[PDB]
């Protein structure tokens, strides 16, 4: 069987992300907040580096693997690409929700990253 197609991976990613945030009573991480990013064609690469700032949260380790599948960006806790602007940090729960609108959005155009 060949790898999972791109559109199929997005649906798998959207369904899994929704499942862990819909049944969440409180922030999955210890209230960890992440830097806001501009949602653009490089959402997976930009979103990944912002998450590299969250450690100890197993609930998102799988998310990190799936996001990498869309962005071969090996980012280290020392290398940063989108955190150039001095924006404010936001709760991870809100970060996923804001990203969720864009995830299903590319599905309508079928243009995956």
UniProtKB/Swiss-Prot annotation:
Disulfide bonds join 29-57, 45-71. GO terms for molecular function: cytokine activity; interleukin-13 receptor binding. It comes from the Eukaryota. Its main location: secreted. It is linked to Allergic rhinitis: A common disease with complex inheritance characterized by mucosal inflammation caused by allergen exposure. Belongs to the IL-4/IL-13 family. Cytokine that plays important roles in allergic inflammation and immune response to parasite infection. Synergizes with IL2 in regulating interferon-gamma synthesis. Stimulates B-cell proliferation, and activation of eosinophils, basophils, and mast cells. Plays an important role in controlling IL33 activity by modulating the production of transmembrane and soluble forms of interleukin-1 receptor-like 1/IL1RL1. This is Interleukin-13.
């Amino acid at each position: 069987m060949g790898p999972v197609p791109p559109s199929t991976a997005l649906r798998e990613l959207i369904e899994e992300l929704v499942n862990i945030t819909q049944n969440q009573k409180a922030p999955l991480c210890n209230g960890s907040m992440v830097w806001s990013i501009n949602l653009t064609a490089g959402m997976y690469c930009a979103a990944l580096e912002s998450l590299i700032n969250v450690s100890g949260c197993s609930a998102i380790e799988k998310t990190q693997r799936m996001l990498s599948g869309f962005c071969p960006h090996k980012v280290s806790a020392g290398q940063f690409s989108s955190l150039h602007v001095r924006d404010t940090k936001i709760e991870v729960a809100q970060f996923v929700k804001d990203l969720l609108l864009h995830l299903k959005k590319l599905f309508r155009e079928g243009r995956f990253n």
